[PDB]
Design an enzyme around this catalytic site. Structure first.
Site, PDB file in Angstrom:
ATOM      1  CD  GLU A   1      -4.172   3.986  -1.796  1.00  0.00           C
ATOM      2  OE1 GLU A   1      -4.313   3.369  -0.730  1.00  0.00           O
ATOM      3  OE2 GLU A   1      -4.672   3.587  -2.869  1.00  0.00           O
TER       4      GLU A   1
ATOM      5  CG  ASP B   1      -2.255   0.706   0.847  1.00  0.00           C
ATOM      6  OD1 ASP B   1      -2.628   0.736  -0.351  1.00  0.00           O
ATOM      7  OD2 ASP B   1      -2.897   1.234   1.776  1.00  0.00           O
TER       8      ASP B   1
ATOM      9  CE1 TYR C   1      -3.445  -2.834   6.077  1.00  0.00           C
ATOM     10  CE2 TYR C   1      -2.848  -1.048   4.574  1.00  0.00           C
ATOM     11  CZ  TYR C   1      -3.514  -2.239   4.822  1.00  0.00           C
ATOM     12  OH  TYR C   1      -4.279  -2.844   3.849  1.00  0.00           O
TER      13      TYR C   1
ATOM     14  CG  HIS D   1      -5.826   3.181   3.003  1.00  0.00           C
ATOM     15  ND1 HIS D   1      -6.001   2.761   1.703  1.00  0.00           N
ATOM     16  CD2 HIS D   1      -7.046   3.587   3.435  1.00  0.00           C
ATOM     17  CE1 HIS D   1      -7.271   2.893   1.367  1.00  0.00           C
ATOM     18  NE2 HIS D   1      -7.929   3.389   2.401  1.00  0.00           N
TER      19      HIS D   1
ATOM     20  CD  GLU E   1      -5.810   0.560  -5.376  1.00  0.00           C
ATOM     21  OE1 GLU E   1      -6.413   0.183  -4.356  1.00  0.00           O
ATOM     22  OE2 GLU E   1      -5.203   1.630  -5.399  1.00  0.00           O
TER      23      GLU E   1
ATOM     24  CD  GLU F   1      -6.614   0.136  -0.870  1.00  0.00           C
ATOM     25  OE1 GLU F   1      -6.785   1.085  -1.666  1.00  0.00           O
ATOM     26  OE2 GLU F   1      -5.686   0.151  -0.046  1.00  0.00           O
TER      27      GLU F   1
HETATM   28 MN   LIG Z   1      -4.523   1.800   0.477  1.00  0.00          MN
HETATM   29 MN   LIG Z   2      -5.805   2.084  -3.207  1.00  0.00          MN
END
Ligand SMILES: [Mn+2]
Ligand SMILES: [Mn+2]
Ligand SMILES: Nc1ncnc2c1ncn2[C@@H]1O[C@H](COP(=O)(O)OP(=O)(O)OP(=O)(O)O)[C@@H](O)[C@H]1O
Ligand SMILES: Nc1ncnc2c1ncn2[C@@H]1O[C@H](COP(=O)(O)OP(=O)(O)OP(=O)(O)O)[C@@H](O)[C@H]1O
Ligand SMILES: Cc1cn([C@H]2C[C@H](O)[C@@H](COP(=O)(O)OP(=O)(O)OP(=O)(O)O)O2)c(=O)[nH]c1=O
Ligand SMILES: [Mg+2]
Ligand SMILES: [Mg+2]
Ligand SMILES: [Mn+2]
Ligand SMILES: [Mn+2]
Lengths: 683, 289, 289, 683
Positions: B82, B51, B90, B86, B149, B183
């Protein structure tokens, strides 16, 4: 993968440059010797089968109680004596997946094709063993096919309603709107497609008791109906399908159309409710002359004249509406509206187009009412009277809401057996029985119209199949000559059967005396014009059958004048979507979309060739998209001249052509007398 | 025909890591076996690493070469998700479940892992090969992006969805479900941009681009099978994960306007529970016949 | 020492123009003279152009060259705001107040306006001159970006603020204040990155960089004067706006760590007037009282 | 900017470190010197005014025809003799913008405050000039305020219904669901807020005619109701407001709640449909003991026991439901559900919380039915019986649908006039008259329950205003002592007036004999506990007024036993949204949210200080958010012990407190006997 699936996929694997069509037959054998015969439930004799189906609430015991078991056994033996074989894998697959009766857990097959046909015939005959055998011979020969509701649900305890389509008139009131929503949910619960005429509802920005700019227009009612159809979705099995019809002279006509635009906002977009537009000849005349048109506010017109805008002729009242200062109207460009219709049909296939004047210039029951809208498949065109649903504790004025029973003649099988007359009369009797045993306790206008109009719809399938299997191009003049003769015969024998039923029952449909059947006007073109085939090939195709002449039509006109007609409406050509698979027939009178269709079922893919497709008739099975839509319009008009209701006419368009081509096709259809246009499917 | 609609769907899906409290996952995490914890860590690091490439290179490089102000804005929004949403999500999941030293070691391992590296570098290679004003090289990169994705993430997503469908690690599973939902739309959108390029090509060039896409899919798929066995054999799930990879490969192909490559298969029910025609004016004389 | 707090501030400031209903401005707009409406449309169009390029080009390119995932996340977020939020908001305003033909005309007007083209040429030229691993070219582009954020927008911002301060066009004005609040933090952040690079240089190099910054400011300033006169003479405000842009030029210099260049002046007081919940589980003691 | 608006905004400008509250008074003068008098239509005499208003369809002829013109003139003179002056600008602004009668062009003012009060009094008295003068003195002293529907619409021809709180029971059928949608539309058309009980509806995945997994659950019904309420929006004037109540043991409770989550999809979230959750004591016991709970499928319970799940006591039925294999249920965590409720209330203030056992342990009409749900404002708590709406041409079984009559006492004005008894009795008479004159022809159960139950809601307002202007903190024990005494007197005189009306008319409410009033149980706590003030300050506040003792309550109990009670329900404390402005009062019995509230009207800003706010009582006018919610709960429970129906109880939370604090407040409300919780407003 199953063996029959591999055999069916072996069709496309070419051998010596040719498709392996015969492999399809092998597939059916496999499909029966590996799946159907193993998954079928066999009993010691028919008595145990009938008892098991009756006590386990699979069958209604009332219709079976009208026959002694010997008669039922004789009917079943007549059904099985034909040794009917499905010529294609997809026919048997479609029957045993969509129409054959299965157990409660759907793990086994309780009904064969012969069992289903016998049960439907016994239901049709209503205690007549000979009539039941006649129906068995008619259906096992596949000359006649009852509609999907009737074929699937006849004689079943867990059945729905046998009527496919319902048409509701919605009056301009909150009580009427709520009643329409309730009736739509009730009829979608029964499984039928519901069409609602929203032309009487006042437009957006109208007054609700002297407070102005208060109404939400037809778009709010559209959203309510869309949610109602979403909620009532046949217990989650089949998505609830509804249709909304609006006159093109309604002020909301743009907003109406904006419900189907792909860029529409969520507060306007409607996704489970099909839309149809009713176009009088006045709109086409205004667009042709490029004169700016006027859309009208229905409530102002109702206040000024006492009648609804769609209740009277726009061709004679449009100028009075425009010149009346007490009538509110908005300026529109009729050519721009036509282009918007063409663009919408290119993008999504909507709206349905109903040429109101084309419907009402040959409508036989204009005295009862003019046809103001069509059904969900845009082939039912009948008189309807709006209902006045009043407040609670007040009596409601129940009108007429259209509802007819569908049944299709298989043209190839009917003409092969040289039995146009017998098939038409038996199908008319079966549809009359379906109408008589239909009683809907939550739609009062539908019930009253079913009891009074006694309207039925007798369609036809496998027109293109018959033409291609006989070496006739669907666009050829010979094909149109065949359609003219065949459907004149169908109309003649349907009128004869309707008059015979009226004579045998001593009753006609309500308000028949004011119809063109009673006055003899309906038979005019039939007592002056001869519809015998003009080509020798078509005449040979009709050999062994007495083609009615002007003298036979004169005798039929006299017979109708003496006895009347039992049915207000008799012939309507439905799309016949999935039941055409079982009959090994092309869908309706439309040309085939593709020669071999690839359909994905489960994780497998299957190929269905068109019935009778082979090397010698490959090019006679011309795909609809490759055809000239003008000649298809000519064919549909030729058929329509003999059909009292409409025909579900789907337009088959190429991606290269523009919205101007679609508008030209629509205007040629209007010029040629096409009553309704169903879909604009783009390849 | 589509950018404003995707703009709307993207911005209305906006979310932030802080919205989901993660600490309550420790109440199910402590009950997993060593192999389960190991697989989860490795899968998570795999997703994180892939990612990051998409945030630093994949989305910004496509935004750079695509023409159109509105498309650039949507692509910028996706790149933002992203990098800003994201990536932080994570990191948050990791910091909750493992101590600092364990996180560093897992990332060292996954960074050296042959199957993770093979796919990561294959995708990055195609992004680096885009040439200014060359729509063919852009299309190839878009195919790579859609494959990441809509396909490559799913061998990884399987495990959090598997737990999520069982009532385990629900907070991190909710986060993963939000990421996955982003995604999915990213893959569909980039897919439409690729189809636009594809449709501008000749028939011979189209056939050549189809061969490219299928060949690339095959290379990635064969490596995914190895990646899958490497991670999931120790927890006995590889057979079902393989079905999930093929199902998502078919979705990726459909995003690119191509036919499915693999036969239809049913998916693990626990994972399931976790989861314009040309306007031409009327010219008159069209009303006369 | 600062990126994390800028990250948090940027994400907590997230907004969409659709949050603000604009139909309330319909009457105060209708009531303005033709000259006032013309200047207003053109002013916002000039702003739209600047944000278009800041979002498409400026912020993404700076993000590409700045090291560190968190710094990149902030810059990516700022880029998204420029084109997905700011530039788009102006279209929301235009679509509410103006008919399509007036909207079409003003966008045609930006393409042919020589001052707006010159300022775009100069700023975007510097963005596109950035060379990988060359900190001096990066510094020059960051100076250009600070001048766009903290100086160039202000000839445009003046007019919505001038109306807001009189209780006119207050919904549009609310949007503009949100945009301005964002640009202020964007200018500070990019300013801090520029100072990082400047502080690495020899005294001789620093002297050259100050020359670059001051020469660029003067060149942009002289062009902005002509732009300001062109727009504001018809509404009688050019001298007032000029004082405002000089005020903001000093703020841009300060964001770059430089001394103010223009003398202080009294700004129109009207313009100055124009300026999930936390979850705890339920204890067994919370059920007894 | 108008002069009065400048004078109002001058309040915030601080002089000598103090707000210029007195400037507000000047603003009122300006608002009358510059605007109100200029735009007020004046007539040569009252006869001309009444003739113009009647002829132009502003007023009704029937209620004015009951009096001679001399009596009407005397009533108007009595209204104008008070020389009433609005003390704050916002009071006059709210009256003349919301309630004063305006011309059809909405540019002139036809009704002053005295004119509207006189018209409402004449409507109330129904032909009694002395009673009309008593009503005029009641309303011009601002002791009693009819609700917004009654105050706005009384005596007006162009009007909605005088009742705006409607509670509907929805039975588990498609006919009943469609009828509920229709009735909701009709009542929203009348201008009323409609609450629907959805607990009887079977959950998602239930059987329809013995086909499995067919029901869409209550969420589809909520979507239908939300569309109906969006469509019916008072002729495009106000947003259609509806409420849906579901029992927490209904299985759909999560999906129900999921309709209010921000992350919910467009096919899940309902935007114009408020939601309330009914929480029986069993759920609270299960959450308290941390035992996992079960949410039940209502249709399985109905099939097993013949009664709906919400129609039986879950405290004694829960174990039998769990142990019954034929009852389908799903495992849930009650503490997780409580946390979800708290989180949803933090995000959006939804759902409303109804503590079923708290309502029903003091419900006087449990024999008729237990209170299963509340209204849109969560203060109406009455017995309701579901209706069985059958198919067409079939007789419906009409039940009881709640519709109570709203009206609020101004505690400050009532107590400063020492007229608790007279105000309560006159308000009861006016509410009885409005209930008797209400006739809804599209809601059969609402009309039947209005005729039978004769239920009215007499509320109170300006509690915090009265306490703050008397140097009493809202959270102080003295405030609760005053509330106890005042509302016990209100209950005493309401019961006395109900019994007097029953004796005069010779009739009680239907099924009164089974009520606790008839058995004397209702008076138990009143014949044993003395509710006289325990603090000397409160006793001095009640000086000059007779406080009913235990002997007086025994006499009232004997009087009710001998004569009965006319109203099934008498007291309910409504939020009193906009009428609190006109009366210059704090809203309901709630504490004030802000000391001075800033509002934006048009493009102008306005400032409303709380009534009587000054430097001396600035500290006593504590804001609701700064208050301890436990003490607010204590005060609301103290009031609720004397209110037969519920109290609109809004929680006022800070952004700092978490969902644990919200759950603690809810559980303390349940412990303290709070019947309903309205809103969770976060600052
Ligand atoms: Mn992502
Ligand atoms: Mn993405
Ligand atoms: N195409 C088909 N359509 C319908 N039923 C079929 C078809 N093919 C096979 N069956 C069913 O499966 C059985 C298998 O028998 P098959 O057709 O192979 O010939 P058979 O055993 O010689 O007998 P018969 O043809 O006389 O029934 C048939 O008797 C019939 O019941
Ligand atoms: N605060 C107020 N509330 C209500 N009406 C007011 C108020 N102030 C003024 N008015 C209206 O304006 C009129 C003028 O009142 P003003 O204060 O000038 O003196 P007045 O002695 O009450 O006058 P009037 O001869 O009208 O009775 C009042 O009669 C009343 O109709
Ligand atoms: C009540 C209501 C009606 N309408 C529209 C839809 C109906 O077609 C139309 C007629 O409503 P009606 O039910 O006929 O209202 P009415 O009879 O009280 O008013 P009138 O005497 O003028 O007939 O009003 C709305 O759009 N929204 C609403 O909320
Ligand atoms: Mg009406
Ligand atoms: Mg039922
Ligand atoms: Mn910006
Ligand atoms: Mn910026």
């Amino acid at each position: 993968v199953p063996k029959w699936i591999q055999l069916n996929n072996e069709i496309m694997i070419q051998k010596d440059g040719k498709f392996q069509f015969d492999k399809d037959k092998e597939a059916v054998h496999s499909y029966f010797v590996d799946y159907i015969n193993q998954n079928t439930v066999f009993f010691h004799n028919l008595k145990e089968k009938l008892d098991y189906l009756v006590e386990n609430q699979y069958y209604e015991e009332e219709f079976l109680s009208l026959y002694s078991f010997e008669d039922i056994k004789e009917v079943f033996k007549t059904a099985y004596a034909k040794k009917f074989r499905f010529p294609s894998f997809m026919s048997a697959f479609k029957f045993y997946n969509d129409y054959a009766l299965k157990t409660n857990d759907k793990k086994k097959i309780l009904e064969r094709y012969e069992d289903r046909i016998s049960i439907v015939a016994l239901f049709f005959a209503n205690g007549d063993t000979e009539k039941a055998k006649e129906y068995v011979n008619l259906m096992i020969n596949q000359e006649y096919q009852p509609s999907t509701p009737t074929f699937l649900n006849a004689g079943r305890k867990r059945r729905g309603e046998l009527v496919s389509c319902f048409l509701l008139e919605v009056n301009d009131s909150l009580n009427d709107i709520s009643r329409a929503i309730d009736i739509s949910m009730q009829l979608s619960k029964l499984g039928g497609g519901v069409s609602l005429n929203l032309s009487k509802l006042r437009a957006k920005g109208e007054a609700i008791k002297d407070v102005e700019n208060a109404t939400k227009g037809v778009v709010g009612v559209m959203k309510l109906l869309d949610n109602a159809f979403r909620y009532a979705d046949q217990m989650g099995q089949r998505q609830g399908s509804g249709a909304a019809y609006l006159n093109i002279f309604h002020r909301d006509i743009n907003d109406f159309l904006d419900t189907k635009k792909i860029s529409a906002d969520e507060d306007v977009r409607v996704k489970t409710l099909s839309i149809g537009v009713v176009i009088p000849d006045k709109f086409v005349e205004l667009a042709r002359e490029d004169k700016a048109a006027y859309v009208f506010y229905p409530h102002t017109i109702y206040k000024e004249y006492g009648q609804h805008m769609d209740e009277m002729d726009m061709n004679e009242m449009y100028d009075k509406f425009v010149d009346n200062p007490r009538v509110k109207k908005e300026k529109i460009n009729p050519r721009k509206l036509l282009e918007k219709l063409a663009m919408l049909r290119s993008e999504s296939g909507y709206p349905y187009i109903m040429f109101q004047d084309n419907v009402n210039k040959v409508h036989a029951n204009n005295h009862i009412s003019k046809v103001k809208f069509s059904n969900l498949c845009s082939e039912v065109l009948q008189a309807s009277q709006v209902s006045s649903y009043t407040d609670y504790d007040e009596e409601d004025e129940i009108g007429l809401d259209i509802s007819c029973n569908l049944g299709s003649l298989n043209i190839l099988n009917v003409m092969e057996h040289k039995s146009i007359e017998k098939t038409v009369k038996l199908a008319t009797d079966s549809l009359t029985h379906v109408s008589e045993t239909t009683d809907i306790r939550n739609a009062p206008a539908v019930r009253r119209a079913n009891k009074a109009m006694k309207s039925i719809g007798l369609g036809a399938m496998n027109l293109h199949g018959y033409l291609a299997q006989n070496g006739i191009a669907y666009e050829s003049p010979e094909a149109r000559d065949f359609a003219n003769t065949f459907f004149m015969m169908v109309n003649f024998y349907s009128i004869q059967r309707s008059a015979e039923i009226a004579k045998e029952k001593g009753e006609t449909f309500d308000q028949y005396e004011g119809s063109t059947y009673a006055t003899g006007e309906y038979f005019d073109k039939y007592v002056s014009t001869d519809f015998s085939p003009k080509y020798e090939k078509i005449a040979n195709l009709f050999e062994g059958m007495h083609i009615p002449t002007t003298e036979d039509w004169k005798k039929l006109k006299a017979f109708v004048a003496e006895h009347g007609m039992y049915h207000s409406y008799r012939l309507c050509i439905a799309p016949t979507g999935s039941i055409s698979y079982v009959q090994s027939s092309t869908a309706s009178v439309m040309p085939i979309m593709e020669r071999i269709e690839e359909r994905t079922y489960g994780n497998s893919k299957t190929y269905y060739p068109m019935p009778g497709l082979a090397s010698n008739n490959w090019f006679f099975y011309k795909e609809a998209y490759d055809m000239d839509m003008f000649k298809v319009v000519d064919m549909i008009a030729t058929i329509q001249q003999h059909i009292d209701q409409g025909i579900s006419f789907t337009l088959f368009l190429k991606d290269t052509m523009t919205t101007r081509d679609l508008n030209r096709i629509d205007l040629y259809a209007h010029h040629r007398g096409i009553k309704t246009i169903y879909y604009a499917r783009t390849k | 025909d589509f950018t404003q609609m995707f703009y709307n769907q993207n911005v209305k899906q906006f979310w932030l890591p802080e919205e989901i409290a993660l600490n309550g996952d420790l109440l199910t995490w402590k009950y997993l076996g060593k192999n389960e914890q190991d697989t989860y860590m490795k899968v998570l690091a795999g997703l994180t690493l892939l990612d990051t490439e998409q945030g630093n290179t994949g989305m910004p490089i496509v935004a750079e070469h695509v023409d159109g102000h509105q498309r650039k804005a949507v692509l910028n929004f996706m790149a933002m998700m992203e990098n800003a949403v994201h990536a932080k999500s994570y990191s948050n999941i990791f910091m909750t479940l493992a101590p600092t030293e364990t996180i560093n070691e897992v990332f060292e391992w996954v960074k050296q892992n042959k199957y993770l590296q093979k796919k990561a570098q294959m995708i990055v290679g195609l992004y680096k090969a885009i040439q200014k004003d060359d729509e063919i090289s852009l299309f190839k990169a878009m195919v790579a992006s859609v494959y990441l994705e809509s396909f490559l993430f799913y061998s990884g997503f399987y495990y959090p969805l598997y737990f999520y469908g069982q009532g385990k690690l629900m907070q991190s599973g909710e986060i993963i479900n939000l990421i996955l939902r982003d995604e999915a739309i990213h893959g569909v959108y980039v897919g439409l941009l690729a189809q636009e390029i594809y449709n501008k090509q000749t028939e011979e060039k189209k056939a050549e681009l189809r061969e490219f896409a299928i060949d690339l899919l095959n290379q990635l798929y064969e490596n995914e099978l190895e990646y899958t066995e490497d991670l999931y054999d120790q927890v006995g799930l590889s057979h079902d994960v393989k079905k999930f990879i093929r199902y998502n490969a078919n979705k990726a192909l459909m995003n690119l306007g191509f036919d499915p490559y693999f036969e239809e298969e049913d998916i693990n029910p626990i994972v399931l529970n976790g989861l314009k025609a040309t306007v031409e004016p009327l010219k008159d004389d069209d009303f006369y016949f």
